[PDB]
RNA sequence: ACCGCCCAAGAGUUCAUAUCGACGGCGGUGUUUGGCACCUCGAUGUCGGCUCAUCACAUCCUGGGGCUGAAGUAGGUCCCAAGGGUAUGGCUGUUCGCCAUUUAAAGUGGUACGCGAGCUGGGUUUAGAACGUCGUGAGACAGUUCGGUCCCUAUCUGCCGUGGGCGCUGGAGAACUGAGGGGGGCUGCUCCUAGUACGAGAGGACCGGAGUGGACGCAUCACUGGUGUUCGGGUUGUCAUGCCAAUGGCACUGCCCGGUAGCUAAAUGCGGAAGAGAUAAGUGCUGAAAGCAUCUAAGCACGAAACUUGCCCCGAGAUGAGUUCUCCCUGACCCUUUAAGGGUCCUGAAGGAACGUUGAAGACGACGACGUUGAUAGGCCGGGUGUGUAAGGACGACCUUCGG
RNA sequence: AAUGAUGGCCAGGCUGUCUCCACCCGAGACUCAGUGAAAUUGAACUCGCUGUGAAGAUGCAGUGUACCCGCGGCAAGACGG
RNA sequence: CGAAUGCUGACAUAAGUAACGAUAAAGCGGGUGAAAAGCCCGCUCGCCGGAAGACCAAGGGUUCCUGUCCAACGUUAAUCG
């Protein structure tokens, strides 16, 4: 039964579902790349991509908001200052999906996700 | 809550007959160096859609 | 007057002049087409094969292309036979209008219902509940007894058992008439057709007379 | 969605009045009495609002000389002929379920006369 | 919407403030009956000098149930509390002589025409 | 034992079968109380409740039909007829039972006195303690009261759904037949034709026209709600976050006031059927046999919800492989246990497939849409659910001569 | 008198105990990876229906029906353990 | 020597299924490596705080530290213990 819903369960707790995406929230700004599980990365897009729409707005609230989730005012200071001019005029498409194997530790499907422009 | 008579040898195969593994065989051949790479996957050299992404 | 079936657009509550409420089925039917002869002549029983809708140029496959190429027709979403009622009778290839429901006063609905997968038996057949307390031993929803003892000792075929139900064709006939727009090709009917919304469900003039 | 969009884009009401969750409300609902038609009052407050267009709602809470007969109207069903405001309310939230058990001497809310 | 032993208030001047649903009329298994339904019920109290005494039993002509009342547009005029008006055995009509509070126009058919003569509401 | 029936006292006001019957007579079934001990004592768990059933018909209502000491009504009785239907509470472990009140009406019986590898344990056969009684006791009572442990991860049969494989004598994509199967067969009530028929009168029609049930099955958000821990606002303290401004957490989401879209019923449409056939009961047609005659023996009409059609749906692996529409396409060698033959050089067509972006399709599978071209999904511009007056800047005044 | 995790009954309050169930959040149940058990076991190519029989049949006589093999469920039977 | 619910030794069987020992939670850079989720450093999270902190007694017998190895052990991998 899942007509018309959005989100995921992912063996994970809402507040932690809430949180466990958190640290990334500013994080992958910091290095711009990882390996990750695609569905999570897929969702990480859904985790990040929707969050990345944040990447277009600088005023007081967001400063709390980007600090608001992932609990940090580090990365927020970054975007406030630096990345704004990067994606001036794109209808999205700020990250890109690249398949890279399977975690040798667990057979899980490996995935590199990176900013469409990336470029730390 | 148990079998009541011990099954035959031959049956055991048939139950095992659909569990046969399936081969991939759909290899994809890249355009830059030609290193065999899975279709839709960055190469072992980290290549996909032809370009050198990442860099390792 | 053969029936006309559409995509289960959705539904509405149709509003009137004097306090009349009409929550009606909403459905899409394009200009229909009968595409072949079925009768004595080539099969011995009479039927009218009908496809409606459209397909994207590249996907009309040569034999079906030939099927439509031999037909020389646009692609439609599916070919249906309307069994010829001695006034019913068609031959290949005609693109159809909807006037065939001039009065009807009742039509059908038959098509894939809402997706459900393994529905619960409590829902499929309106079974009962056991009590939720006073020593219930893990049986808040089981079906309970099904059959007899050392006498016939077998399970009668057809027994209503819980499982997948719905999400499939469903004939809905003898259905009051409310309203249509031929100019828009909707069908808006007091009472809402089965299936998933957006479905096709066989809408035909009443067979219960 | 573009099917009924034109279908019922022409069936939602034409000139609905002012209310909030807690504004005073009275749906003159043409009801059956004898052999002639007339208008009979159902004056109340909104405790619950539904911004859903034609199938929406705007709530009326009367007091029926002690026990009301409670009404969930259709703003956009022509069975609601019209609304005539006696006063609006001063509300905070969306749904004034509190408007009921609040009675008599305290049952009032001030006018949000702004 | 009156069911076995439904809490029952009284809309009448008989004194009894007490009634309780025990049997619906009109057809077997009739479950949720109200509005204009008549059912078998029993009186549990009255006023001191009323026309009924503790224990007298009768049926019902409903005028209120917590479920309120539907109307032409799907709209409903809904009841706040389950208060009712009983009926005679033979003459029908509420055993009383003065009735008060909401009834239902759905009881309007000239059979309960007696009440519809002089009410404060409906 | 029960039911069934045979005789005819007699009754019955008449009349032995309107409806009863002496004394005697002959059956049927196998359900009550019984007999017998052939199987189970290296285990076949007891009473009753709860959910789910199923058939027989010695017919409860409905249907039909006959008769009747059956005027309408309401009975009594006999033949046909098994499609559908078949109460809610109090009292006690109870079944039983009784009782209160309803209805068309609360039919009788088999199935290990159905059903514990689906539930419970209140009763009845364990250890504690009591009273009456009975014996010197030990203890007993088939006399009575308080308390007290219930296990199974489903091999096979079976049954509900859902796939892979192979064949149908070339391959591929469409539309098919309808052998055969399965769900439905309620009606209550009330109003008009008809206080008319009957019936003195009462009261009460036949066959027919109008309205409502309630139960029941299919359908849908499209009311009405509900809900909705991702949609909002108000709050208790505090962790603490360079301190006035803001956090997040934590406190069951901290408590509380709300709630999309969908999903849903108390909300809203829908249906019981119309139709034909055959009849049946039983009665109706002619018919002599037996000069009559007759429902019978030959040639003629009707007859129920009971059976073949009318309705839905399923449905050619119907191995009897049924029916029509398409279109893909017709390579060089040899060789022998030389033919429906094995092997060497060109060719891979329809299509399919696979990996990718996906949905009211979903356990998986399986299906659907769709594969950059991809509107497939998201992302960027217009929508506006639901919450319900954010936070922050400033502003001045607010407080003193003005604000009266 | 007072007392009681004491016996039996009747009032008030209360509410999903029930007519009659609806939605939502969590942990399993399902797919992929790795490791990896037990009770049980004459032998088996392991259909229904009437009847007969150490007297209640998968395996007897007569008789109808049925392409090969999985996967998710259910618990009448195998006098199941 | 076939049968004694004989005894001892070896191999089947259900099944590649149940199960993987508290519902306090994790995330990313950098290092090694034949080979990082589980090891080290770094930067973030969250939980306990009359304890999941610090110290005696009894009991225990080298488990303490440094180098060094990956057969078996560790309910998986292991540069680790």
UniProtKB/Swiss-Prot annotation, chain C:
Name of the gene this protein is made from: rplC
Function: One of two assembly initiator proteins, it binds directly near the 3'-end of the 23S rRNA, where it nucleates assembly of the 50S subunit.
Entry annotated with the keyword Plastid: no
Modified residues (N5-methylglutamine): 150
Protein name: Large ribosomal subunit protein uL3
The organism's taxonomic lineage, starting at the top: Bacteria, Pseudomonadati, Pseudomonadota, Gammaproteobacteria, Enterobacterales
Modification(s) after translation: Methylated by PrmB.
A single GO BP: cytoplasmic translation
Subunit (UniProt): Part of the 50S ribosomal subunit. Forms a cluster with proteins L14 and L19. In pull-down experiments interacts with CedA.
